[model samples]
Target: HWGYGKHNGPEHWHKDFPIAKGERQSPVDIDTHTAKYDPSLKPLSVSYDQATSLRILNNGHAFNVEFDDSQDKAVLKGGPLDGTYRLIQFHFHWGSLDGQGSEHTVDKKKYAAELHLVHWNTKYGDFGKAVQQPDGLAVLGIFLKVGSAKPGLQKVVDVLDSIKTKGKSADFTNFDPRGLLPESLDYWTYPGSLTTPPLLECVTWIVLKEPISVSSEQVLKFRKLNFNGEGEPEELMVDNWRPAQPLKNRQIKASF
Candidate 1:
């Protein structure tokens, strides 16, 4: 049970998941001064079919909206990637309060939350196989700030009650997640791992420089979810974000 609790949290994860301390670990602080702008990096292109949205679920870690990855209907291309990556799911990491929640930070600045869109490269056959390769996974991370209410997020928040406990799931479809993106697609790219255990170092992280806004009221709604399963002692599902790992020798690229 590698959760965001004192007993089984990130601090204790390296004991079991050795890769937690591996090179190219994720959620590194993006020192903008060090990120080099590369003209060769192409503008990111995303095409998401609304029908690819399948269901939303509370997977004991975080709530995620699952997508149908059987086809390349919803795909991400360009921008530090060699091949098409299929969208699998999108999830969020948040804190108990708005002061700190985001995993990856900008010049040591923390945002209210972070949204991750998980995708797998199709050249590796499937997600399971792709996850093992260096160029397997590509995660698009979008920072969330507390301010004006976002309409796209409101629809997702409204259904929180249906999945109040861990492992709970509900039918959720026809939702285009692109609405949650900010006006600009400018991003910082790097080689990193999954933020959670077994923190595989196979992800090419593309973190958006611009942040989207979400109301404080909407953020509070997410806290109402439980990390514990039904009939177990209830615990607030907050502070699910991991701290920034060491950047090491990897170079951070910018697509400005």
Candidate 2:
């Protein structure tokens, strides 16, 4: 009922799923000036174990890098969150061109892409049980910029050739997700939801202020990965990002 194509895309999602028009939806345009600064917010503490890295797969949406969430090997703490959030998986949304496509924008400006690291609140239980409640999930947003080559992403790019089509997956290990983040931990935060289907309103979003770098040539490799499965006509997977949603009565907070 909902896909990114024009006929069934985000514009028409509200027709079937009424909550698509809900007040607390995600990917809001963040106006830093209007966001309240909270000095009480504690510094962010992020820890990831390389051994916890599992594999990468093309699920017809984006390539997800899964981790060992069964244990607390990788976790995000402090910041705007109350309890520890265990890292489950991470993915990206981007444009074919270098200039546009992040879901959440800064001052209404889009970046080349956006990276999402999804986690579940462990205090409640497993992710499946927690995703249904508010404050049950937390997603970290990192903007990707076109610049010098990112050596950290090189390994992930190397495996893309193997999982070029939907339903394909490859073993990916020994990689610390921390390599993908920026130097600054300062962020803009608020309550939001998943950008994709189901659009669950359970995410506590923490978007970093600084963007990470990726080369233009490196990005083309991602586009080469097709959206269709083997035998279906090849379709580029680029431009998979959703547009910014409404902020409504919710207040966004600053961690700096």
Candidate 3:
């Protein structure tokens, strides 16, 4: 019953999911001035095969490109991670306008949108079980700016019309998520949680410093989606992003 609206939005989430107030909650604003440079952090190693992409779905909160994670065909291994984390799915959070959308920010500056590539640690057995552990999930966050259109992003934007309502989904194949990344893998790393509920505190946040591009027109296409399903009152799905949470005692390490 949690939605990105006034009744059950982030501010009200603490009531239903108590961890919304948890110390390790995510989407923390990275203060570059204080972010320590870690020489030990290795460059992130990301490898994804095109065929692993399976479907695209509108799950009410946001749209996701689901992948076939039955094996190690698509995964993230390096950059603060000890073992392999399979690429499960990837999603986006956007605003009603281009000025703000990204869940995480730099020095309080927001982007047009944010991309989350969710991965589950293989040591935890499965995604469901993995989320329960402290080091179970690894999310690669990429900021999206309104500039030149990204070809890889266009493939995803082109399908938004078909899945305009919640629960709507369709076959989407041969998507290489690597193309969605910014050229430089420089990132800010920290411990955090899922921005959405259950608000689990199991994710290792790796937010890329560089941002990819999305056209302003293409961003409007994302707003066309509805959080409500067929026969329900139509509600445009905008501002589905959660505000930045407190960093508390956590320190962000930069790999540049």
Name the candidate that leads on lDDT.
1
Clashes of each: 0, 0, 0
CA lDDT of 225 in candidate 1? 92
Candidate 2 on 83-118: residue-level lDDT in tens? 899999999998888888699999988999899999
Instruction: Write down the lDDT that model 1 would get.
Output: 0.93
Q: List the residue pairs that clash in candidate 2.
A: none
Q: Where does the lowest 10-residue lDDT sum fall in candidate 2?
A: 1-10
Ordered by lDDT, highest first, the candidates read 1, 3, 2
Candidate 3 residue pairs in clash (backbone atoms < 3 Å) = none
Kindly list the per-residue Cα lDDT of model 1 for residues 159-198, writing each as its tens digit. Answer: 9999999989999988888888899999999999999998
Error of 1 at 58 (Å): 0.4
C-alpha lDDT (0 to 100) for residue 10 of candidate 2: 82
| Collision count of model 3 | 0
Model 3 worst lDDT window (10 residues):
42-51
Better of 1 and 2 by TM-score: 1
lDDT preference between candidates 1 and 3, better one: 1
Q: After superposition, how far is residue 46 of candidate 2 from its true place, in Å?
A: 0.4
